[PDB]
């Protein structure tokens, strides 16, 4: 299976902010995190 | 490590491996938005 470049780094960056912020709702936090990151490009 | 974190990210990562999307972040926005909708 081809492993996309940047996959581990993407998962790591989300995890670092989950550990810092301790969001009760990981799914809502993912929607917001990945939306913000798409916009930070 | 919060309960649920590894399993949540595994569903996303399975779909990335299956679907080979070109933009991982856009695929994450879509996947977790649709999971939030389903919930």
């Amino acid at each position: 299976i081809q492993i996309p470049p940047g996959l581990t780094e993407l998962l790591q960056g989300y995890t670092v902010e989950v550990l810092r912020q301790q969001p009760p709702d990981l799914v809502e936090f993912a929607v917001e995190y990945f939306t913000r990151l798409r916009e930070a490009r | 490590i919060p309960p649920g974190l590894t399993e949540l990210l595994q569903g996303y990562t399975v779909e990335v491996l299956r679907q080979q999307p070109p933009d991982l972040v856009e695929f994450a926005v879509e996947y977790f938005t649709r999971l939030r909708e389903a919930r």
Binding site: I1, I3, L7, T8, E9, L11, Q12, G13, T15, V16, L19 | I1, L5, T6, L9, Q10, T13, V14, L17, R18
Partner: peptide
């Protein structure tokens, strides 16, 4: 199999974030 590969990738990313 893809599901086990995904588990390894995720678990390793979480370990690295710590």
């Amino acid at each position: 199999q893809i599901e086990y590969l995904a588990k390894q990738i995720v678990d390793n990313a979480i370990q690295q974030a710590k």
